[PDB]
Amino acid sequence: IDIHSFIATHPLNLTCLFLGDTNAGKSTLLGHLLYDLNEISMSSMRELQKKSSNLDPSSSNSFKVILDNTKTERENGFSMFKKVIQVENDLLPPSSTLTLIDTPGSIKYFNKETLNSILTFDPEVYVLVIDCNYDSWEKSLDGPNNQIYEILKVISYLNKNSACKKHLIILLNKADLISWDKHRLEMIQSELNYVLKENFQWTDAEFQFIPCSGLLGSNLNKINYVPEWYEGPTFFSQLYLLVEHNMNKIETTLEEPFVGTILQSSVLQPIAEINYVSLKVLINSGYIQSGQTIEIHTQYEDFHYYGIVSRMKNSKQILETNTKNNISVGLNPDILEVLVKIHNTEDFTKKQFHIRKGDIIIHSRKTNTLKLLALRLIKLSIQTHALSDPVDLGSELLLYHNLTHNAVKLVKILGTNDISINPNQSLIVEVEIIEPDFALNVIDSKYITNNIVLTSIDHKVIAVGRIACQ
Ligand SMILES: Nc1nc2c(ncn2[C@@H]2O[C@H](COP(=O)(O)OP(=O)(O)O)[C@@H](O)[C@H]2O)c(=O)[nH]1
Ligand SMILES: [Mg+2]
């Protein structure tokens, strides 16, 4: 196989991450978009609807149940886990893929997954979904620490001074509940536009507003109606352009060292002298091909495993896909099932694998080698902005990095004798892991971002930054 040629025939991907409070209409809208993009067969729908007969009458609808596909989510009536859907069809630009990602707005689960989804997937586009119904909009803006502002406190400040520019779509959803109240939609747009510009430093070219109804599908593409006074674009038309302009992008895949994030892990049973581990892997950079030797580094201090890639398949997705056929090569940013073969050195019943979410996988460096750090004392290059109360030294914080979030202690504010972090500062800071026998896996490379977010124990954003390896 050419290998070099496989990278060429690979379609260029755009990732869209959906964010917003619970009941914003995210799951409904995203499922509806998938239907409009002909990713759901009428038969598939009705089979979903034949199951939905349970819900007549009910609050739920036919579109959200597409994404809320776990039994616990259907019973609870809201999303709990992030859903990743990769779309590739004739409605998109040729040689491209559109990755859509649903996230939970329910705060308990928002804190568990949504913040990490931003760091892990590193999306080109954010989609903020807002319920514009009467009273709902007003109730969702209590103080400077409301959930919507918390979202903006992250995505507004990630990768400042970056070459590639930011892209934000604000969806003014449930427009039908207000009958497209022109004065009200104008108000909400006015208010957000101000806060985005004045407080979060967004520029006109970096964001736009789109009123819509995910349930009715109004203004998603191409009483459902778009008022005569609306001159703006549809949601999908804008996604289409973003994908198109993302085509003209530099691909350094060949120069990139292979790095993967383990999203899920399962050891095949019964265990034996040689064991086989099934991994759901998000490729962060470079490329992986079956047969290659690899290293699996765990969150547990040290404790790395050597193995070989036995086979690779497409990840089990919400949309109907082929999980039977093997894949020759895995390329950034696709997600693959990876079966890893691992020889145990000693007794195999005493020693057992401790592979978990957030663990990483790289190509083998067994004897320009890839630099890898296992850090308990972590140096952070951060920048603060609006801050209610300064953060004094010795404070307990939560360090979000890639897929993991760990409690840390603030131990040193470098460059100054100050004993507290203050508003609007660019600081260098050291934090120390609290959890015993735990170490943060950090890859030192020009190709890896290592973005972080510091929050309080109450999950309120304090700062954004990067791991300072040097
Ligand atoms: N009237 C109206 N209701 C909606 C719309 N989108 C969602 N909903 C309702 O909002 C509730 C929660 O929607 P959901 O898709 O789960 O939003 P999520 O919680 O943010 O993921 C559901 O019971 C829907 O009936 C819309 O465009 N119009
Ligand atoms: Mg949802």
Numbering used by the authors: 255 to 476, 492 to 636, 645 to 747
What do the study authors state?
Ski7 is a cofactor of the cytoplasmic exosome in budding yeast, functioning in both mRNA turnover and non-stop decay (NSD), a surveillance pathway that degrades faulty mRNAs lacking a stop codon. However, a suboptimal polar residue at the putative catalytic site and an unusual polar residue that interacts with the γ-phosphate of GTP distinguish Ski7 from other trGTPases, suggesting it might function rather as a GTP-binding protein than as a GTP-hydrolyzing enzyme.
The refined structure (referred to as Ski7C-GDP-Pi) includes most of the Ski7C polypeptide chain (with the exception of short disordered loop regions) and also includes GDP, a molecule of inorganic phosphate (Pi) and an Mg2+ ion. Manganese was soaked into the crystal prior to data collection to substitute Mg2+ and to unambiguously identify the position of the divalent cation in the electron density using anomalous scattering. The γ-phosphate of the GTP-bound structure and the inorganic phosphate of the GDP-Pi-bound structure are adjacent to each other, but they do not coincide. In the case of the Ski7C-GDP-Pi structure, the complex either mimics a putative post-hydrolysis state (e.g. before release of the Pi product and conversion to an inactive GDP-bound state) or engages the small molecules supplied at high concentrations with the crystallization buffer (i.e. GDP and inorganic phosphate) to mimic a GTP-bound state. Except for a loop approaching the sugar moiety of the nucleotide that is involved in a crystal contact in the Ski7C-GDP-Pi crystal, the structure of Ski7C is essentially identical in the Ski7C-GDP-Pi and Ski7C-GTP complexes, superposing with a root-mean-square deviation of 0.53 Å over all atoms.
